[PDB]
Amino acid sequence: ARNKPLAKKLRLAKALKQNRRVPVWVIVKTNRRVLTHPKRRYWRRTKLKE
Amino acid sequence: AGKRRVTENIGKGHSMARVERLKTPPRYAAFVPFARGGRRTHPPKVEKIIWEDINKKEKRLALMSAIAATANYDLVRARGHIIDNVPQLPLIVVDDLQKVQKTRETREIFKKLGIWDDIVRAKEKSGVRAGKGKMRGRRYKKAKGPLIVVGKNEGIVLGARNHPGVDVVVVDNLGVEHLAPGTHPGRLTVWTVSAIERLRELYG
């Protein structure tokens, strides 16, 4: 929305920062056992809890 | 276990059985004996009775019979024990055996008495078993050897504890399972003068 409160904006910012892929160096360090995390999200498909 | 899942039944009117299913997707079946993740129909229960009672006089008679069978040449050898070089059954030894405190001394005394071969065979028989007992801490299935019965404990228990298959007990704590391991009677036994004296005092 055009008008937002700061607390909601900060929570949305935290979710935005969370939504990213696993580092490639993490993948090689873990030997391909860790390839993803449960916080991956698609804006038009998976909606935020808020 | 298995009774934590909240479920609802669709009922008739749909092409599938009347089974209890979850209220959210994927709507698997739950809380049914024949459903994955459900309760067990008749599981084991702690309240079950496992203790078995034995009359005191009947147990005394069984102990008498085991002690008598200890001195049976046919039964001892039929149980697998090596008594080829044993001088006599029952084997009564002087009371000085009670004071032996070193395992090397006990080994030499046993070699003299002719029961070392039984310890050797017990060690040879001991081995790794088959099944999940290995996962549960029962990797080895050890064998039984000569049983030492002494009137008093003056160090013989410590001097003969370590030998494979060897059990040392005081005649006051003697038991039917001590005399007949695994329900098969005729265990090779070494008695002392004091043990025989106490056994005579008891008559049982």
């Binding site: - | 290995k134 996962m135 549960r136 801490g137 990797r139």
Partner: protein, 120 residues
């Protein structure tokens, strides 16, 4: 310095999750006959400088200096015990410290000397 439980699950859990001050002691190796007679000690944890002879494995009978010790994996590296990669570079073979023998001691450490004196 205490493992009472006889349950394999608990023994293996202790081995896997042992703190570092315990992993330090879990890296002991036996001393040769000469060192054993000289120091009246049967074994000691391995140090990098120590010269070590391999008693088991593909490199049995090979002597060399220790180059690296890893407590997390309970492994060590000895110079000369190496594999060749496909490209051609040489890499070290991790060897359990219990499979080797100590034939020379890097005994410049006062605390290591304290260990020897305490255990003698």
């Amino acid at each position: 310095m205490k493992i009472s439980s006889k349950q394999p699950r608990k023994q293996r859990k202790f081995l896997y999750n042992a703190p570092l001050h315990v992993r330090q002691k879990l890296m002991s190796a036996p001393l040769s006959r000469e060192l054993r007679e000289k120091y009246k000690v049967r074994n000691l944890p391995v140090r990098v400088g120590d010269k070590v002879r391999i008693m088991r494995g593909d490199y049995k009978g090979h002597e060399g200096k220790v180059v690296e010790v890893d407590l997390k994996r309970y492994r060590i590296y000895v110079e000369g015990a190496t594999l060749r990669k496909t490209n051609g570079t040489e890499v070290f073979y991790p060897i359990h410290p219990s499979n080797v023998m100590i034939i020379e001691l890097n005994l410049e450490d006062e605390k290591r000397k304290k260990i020897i004196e305490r255990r003698a």
